Design an enzyme around this catalytic site. Structure first.
Site, mmCIF file in Angstrom:
data_model
loop_
_atom_site.group_PDB
_atom_site.id
_atom_site.type_symbol
_atom_site.label_atom_id
_atom_site.label_comp_id
_atom_site.label_asym_id
_atom_site.label_seq_id
_atom_site.Cartn_x
_atom_site.Cartn_y
_atom_site.Cartn_z
ATOM 1 N NE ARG A 44 -3.636 -0.170 0.192
ATOM 2 C CZ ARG A 44 -4.374 -0.012 -0.900
ATOM 3 N NH1 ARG A 44 -4.520 -0.988 -1.785
ATOM 4 N NH2 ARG A 44 -4.986 1.149 -1.108
ATOM 5 C CG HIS A 93 -3.713 -2.888 -9.824
ATOM 6 N ND1 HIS A 93 -3.916 -2.297 -8.596
ATOM 7 C CD2 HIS A 93 -2.565 -2.367 -10.312
ATOM 8 C CE1 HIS A 93 -2.934 -1.443 -8.359
ATOM 9 N NE2 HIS A 93 -2.104 -1.465 -9.386
ATOM 10 C CB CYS A 150 1.302 -1.923 -12.008
ATOM 11 S SG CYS A 150 0.943 -1.059 -13.564
ATOM 12 C CG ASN A 186 -10.747 -4.454 -7.094
ATOM 13 O OD1 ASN A 186 -10.033 -5.429 -7.303
ATOM 14 N ND2 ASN A 186 -10.268 -3.291 -6.620
HETATM 15 MN MN MN Z 1 -8.098 -6.164 -7.849
HETATM 16 ZN ZN ZN Z 2 0.162 -2.947 -14.646
#
Ligand code: MN
Ligand code: ZN
Ligand code: MN
Ligand code: ZN
Ligand code: ZN
Ligand code: ZN
EC number: 3.1.-.-
Lengths: 162, 162
Positions: free
Chosen positions: A60, A97, A104, A118
DNA sequence: TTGACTCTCTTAAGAGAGTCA
DNA sequence: TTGACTCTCTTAAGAGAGTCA
């Protein structure tokens, strides 16, 4: 900060800094027996991370800027979406993500959606395997597959029906 | 330690009691635009729940039996699986509802698998929509679908490539 | 031995905020 | 003002254990 100009300035500063993070190529399953290539912009493993960035947990980070002599701080992946609604159907919007790579910070690998949406991408068959996400997955989810179930449905007696 | 005979007796008394729970017919999506029917054996909303049963959380219950003066207690959905391995691939096995109805205690609606496998069934397209779970889903997962993503991947400048 | 409550915990996808220098 | 740490929290799929009569 409050004004639209100030928020745009935060996004632009964030993009400039993240744009200097190392670009790491990852080859990924797409579903359908196909493979693709993603270019992740990965925050460093240890300090210094980049101007405005600090680590608050193992995976985090937070981004902080001083505006009008006040410190403003955000989750490090939330910055691209500062002009978006922060909830949907009464559920909190989260940075999500598409590359399933928490270090990333490539905004081309992020979307803004409920925690349920998510999470569910973890099991998606992927963009060439049947993904139905309206904002399409970039890869098959890492947990897609038959699973490893130890025991299935069963009864000893005759009291139950499916 | 309880013998295998004593465990079987526990499973049998649990089945006897759960088989007397109200049986509720539910029409559910199976995937592929097909609908099916599941018969859930639902624990009551409030006490009394049934011999041996008590509520430890809003949607959590336990089953308790006293054998040779020792009190034994199990999570209420774990009892069908007491003769099964309790971990796999280094992950704890969990009771996993194929009907996605926590009050249901029908053992024909339960399987025994990792928490990740368990969660992922929420997004499965279902037994007629492409389920690849080795222990097949009984229905399409409640969260399957295009989702409600608020904002997709995007950048303001030209610092990033996908 | 039993019922009906009480409390806190796990996991892995995500968060906010304080203490120092 | 900026950096580098510290701590706990949220969610929704799941858990174990204590008290009292
Ligand atoms: Mn995720
Ligand atoms: Zn990425
Ligand atoms: Mn489940
Ligand atoms: Zn998808
Ligand atoms: Zn059921
Ligand atoms: Zn399935």
């Amino acid at each position: 900060a409050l004004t639209n100009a100030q928020i745009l300035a935060v996004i632009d500063s964030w993009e400039e800094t993240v744009g200097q993070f190392p670009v790491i190529t990852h080859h990924v399953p797409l579903g359908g027996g196909l493979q693709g290539t993603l270019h992740c912009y990965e925050i460093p493993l240890a300090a210094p991370y980049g101007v405005g960035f600090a680590k608050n947990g193992p995976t985090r980070w937070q981004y902080k800027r001083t505006i009008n002599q006040v410190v403003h701080r955000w989750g490090s992946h939330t910055v691209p979406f500062l002009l978006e609604p922060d909830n949907i159907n009464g559920k909190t919007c989260t940075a999500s993500h598409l590359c399933h790579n928490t270090r990333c910070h490539n905004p081309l690998h992020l979307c803004w959606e409920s925690l349920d949406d998510n999470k569910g991408r973890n099991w998606c068959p992927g963009p060439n395997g049947g993904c139905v996400h309206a904002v399409v997955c970039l890869r098959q989810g890492p947990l897609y597959g038959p699973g490893a179930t130890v025991a299935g449905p069963q009864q000893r007696g005759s009291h139950f029906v499916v």
